[PDB]
Amino acid sequence: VMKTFKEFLLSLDDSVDETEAVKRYNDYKLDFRRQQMQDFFLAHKDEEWFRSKYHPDEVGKRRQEARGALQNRLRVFLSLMETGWFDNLLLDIDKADAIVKMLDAAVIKMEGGTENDLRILE
Amino acid sequence: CKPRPLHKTCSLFMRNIAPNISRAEIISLCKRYPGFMRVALSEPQPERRFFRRGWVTFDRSVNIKEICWNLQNIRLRECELSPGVNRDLTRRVRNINGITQHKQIVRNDIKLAAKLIHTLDDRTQLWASEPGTPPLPTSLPSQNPILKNITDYLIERDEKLIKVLDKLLLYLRIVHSLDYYNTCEYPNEDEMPNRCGIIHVRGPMPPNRISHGEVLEWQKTFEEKLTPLLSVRESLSEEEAQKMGRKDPEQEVEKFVTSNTQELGKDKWLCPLSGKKFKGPEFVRKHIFNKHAEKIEEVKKEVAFFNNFLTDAKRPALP
């Protein structure tokens, strides 16, 4: 728990200035949030989610994983273009069934799906 | 050969996954159930003690009800998973206001979609020319074939103009997981059971005449929602970093060397790393940098690990 504006001023009851009241309180705020930040780092140090978000090695992995998986989705998109799944496909509710068939055809190709695997959608 | 239903997958969902539980532990648990594919984990939520929500997905040809009941009441590090059978996506193709098909908004949406792809392709380095070899300054990235000759259509309801727009949005949605018409991203889609789940779409033609005030109102509302999706990771100021107490790389390395150069007696020095005794202060200094060259750089990583946390503006913290 953090101290309010009144509680900090109760400590220094001697030379109570007008301008220097906000000086020492904001210095307390920065040094309180310094320790609270430091206590969080030591608490959630070894956890994977925190490691993954900030650690040099682990952040290097997730950029490499995501960029690899993102390239798989691009090669799927470019395969759908040249094969011809976006030919007579408009983004309207009238062609809602055609969009669902396309998205399933995309997800098939994402999972290493062959041209034979696409035949079930017919 | 036998054609498979790769688009179809039944899956579990997990409510309580403590942050100390690794991804590898959940994969290791769910691997023994045959027809296993992959585990997804949500961004942890600070209000609920940084616990995570999970999604274990399987091949469709498997009794998901049996797997759920079998997995029921198994606790990784004394933390109950409480799995349930995840439902199928029903309302796949949602819609939004029909005004979007109007020709003035279509032109505006091509401008914005092209701007989104330009940003997202550059950020991810998606079209890298020969990614294995190193990047020279004279090297350029490969062009996106959708972005070729776009402003020709902008300058000088139309079907051919919409076909250009749809290829931009279909790219955004299939590749980067950006649902354009809803103004939202599904960032962790490739791990989740439904790889490319929900898409939003232009509604039916409006009944009444489309007012020009309502056209400008939509375009104002649309761009205000899109700009949050182009968010830069906000780094704090270098004064604020030094005020909050950013650690220096080589200072901690110097603190590491001095701490591992202890004096036993007169002309007798020892390091805890190896345990070889030397007869000088800078004898142990030259020992550590040569023999334990991997150890001193591991400290530099732990410094950057603390600094990169500090650098972030919206840090994870207690509410």
Numbering used by the authors:
A (entry chain A): 148 to 269
B (entry chain C): 411 to 566, 600 to 762
Can I see the authors' text?
Interestingly, T543 is a major phosphorylation site of human ARS2 (Discussion). Loop B (residues 566–598) is around 30-residues long in metazoans, half the length in S. pombe and absent in plants. In metazoans, the first part of the loop is highly acidic (566-EEVSAEEEELLG-577), whereas the second half of the loop is proline-rich, particularly in mammals. Nevertheless, despite extensive co-crystallisation trials, including with the loop B/‘EEEE’ helix deletion mutant, we have never observed any electron density corresponding to FARB bound to ARS2 in a crystal, and all our biochemical evidence suggests that only the C-terminal foot is involved.
ARS2 is a direct interaction partner of CBC and together they form a platform for the assembly of co-transcriptional complexes that determine the fate of diverse RNA Pol II transcripts. Our structural analysis shows that ARS2 is made up of two regions, residues 147–270 and 408–763 that co-fold into a structured core with an intervening glutamate-rich region of unknown function that is likely unstructured. The human ARS2 core has an unusual structure comprising a largely helical ‘body’ from which project N- and C-terminal ‘legs’. We find that the RRM domain is required to bind RNA, whereas a basic patch in the C-terminal leg of ARS2 mediates the interaction with FLASH.
